[PDB]
Design a protein around this ligand. Sequence first.
Ligand SMILES: CC(=O)N[C@@H]1[C@@H](O)[C@H](O)[C@@H](COS(=O)(=O)O)O[C@H]1O
Length: 522
Amino acid sequence: IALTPQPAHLTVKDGRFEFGNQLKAKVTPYQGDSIRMVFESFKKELQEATGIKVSSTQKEAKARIILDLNPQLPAEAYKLNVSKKQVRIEASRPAGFYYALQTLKQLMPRNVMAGVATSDHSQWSLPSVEIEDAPRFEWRGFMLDEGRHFFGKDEIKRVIDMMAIYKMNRFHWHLTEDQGWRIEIKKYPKLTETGAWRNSKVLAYGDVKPDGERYGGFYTQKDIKEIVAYAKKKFIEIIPEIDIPGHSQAAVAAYPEFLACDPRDKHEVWLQQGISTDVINVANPKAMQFAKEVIDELTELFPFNYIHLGGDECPTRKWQKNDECKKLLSEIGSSNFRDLQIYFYKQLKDYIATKPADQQRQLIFWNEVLHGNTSILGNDITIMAWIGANAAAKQAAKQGMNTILSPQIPYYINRKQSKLPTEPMSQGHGTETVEAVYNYQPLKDVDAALQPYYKGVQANFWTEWVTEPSVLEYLMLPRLAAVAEAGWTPQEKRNYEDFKERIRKDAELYDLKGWNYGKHIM
Ligand SMILES: CC(=O)N[C@@H]1[C@@H](O)[C@H](O)[C@@H](COS(=O)(=O)O)O[C@H]1O
């Protein structure tokens, strides 16, 4: 038995459940048939991998598989009880059933989770077990940067597939950057017409120069909707990030006349890595209108109730030199230009609050926003803590803000996972091994009183250096599974050597899916 993430409670019992060629299942009709829909999708996956067919019964006595509603269980929790006679699953919500069925598949040979038939197995069974399971953290995330390099819909579906294996539930889509803007906005076509294309594939840094090759791409709104729907089937919600008002050089290049602090200078999509001073003019009324209208479009495309507005690495230099910005700073009664960033967010937060309930969104920010007078903005925000993350998360929690931990080290899984010279180019020097990732303890030394604010964990994947899907996958796996387990499994049940033995069994899964992965611990 090799389950990842490790469930909260597992007892191995006597004997095995034998599937046979077909069997009857009883599935609760409640919750507007949503649980039957989860089960129908599982039936497809089971048949693909094993050829087993499942029929429906109302009779518990005839049911070899039963899915029952238990309202007492948390939203992502389940019980999975396998005996010789019956598989019994209990959960309170569709996601719980989905995760129970993920665990069920993981109890079978790896091809079942892979969704691929092989010649190896003839008869299918499950070990008898009693499992009660629920995630430690409600937010178990992966972020992909497509601003730096663009991967496109097929690869994002693969990413979602990888996340779902390990019960991750939040995909953070970093779609906008200095070096590219990757989402069609109908009201602002130049964001893609200008911002989605640039004259270099590689991004310059240090002595590395731009390459003069035309490079880019973007998602249509139709593509966005398809991906959102795909992720929903695997109980992954998508949080879009429009990183503003820093990391916005592509947008400024598209609409300099009102977004630039210095509109008489040239503005182009950045062909370099690093930190740009070409930030949005937060004091220009048309810039405010632009941000509102972008948020409006996001609300149409992304149903999840959170939006990420970024706020990392936003130099104030260009604001200090802008008369609109200087006028606004005095008007808001501050002498710190950082407060223009916070005031900008406050205006957007207020705008969102004007909308009907279903269109309202909670806001997430990178932790640098804590350096402003956040009383301007209030504490009903979420802080994604990435730089000095432990300290930043604690500061957020002390202020009553929710926090998500995405520490640069070791949860930036674009970073090298080995010191071997033959590793592909990415950030870091090979210290972010699977072991290092797994050994991070999100709540170490966090006061009991602050722990409720810690909503979970996220691995982030920045693509300055990473251009090819094979390399993305190589760097993602298997470290993604370590973060997934950190998000799911209670700390007291986490053990690196145990994880290593279990994750080794997934090499077969990756091979069957044609996913690349780091081989260092395999
Ligand atoms: C929020 C955030 O991370 N902001 C930036 C990202 O745009 C950048 O891509 C990432 C690279 O990290 S690295 O791979 O560890 O050098 O580091 C930070 O400087």
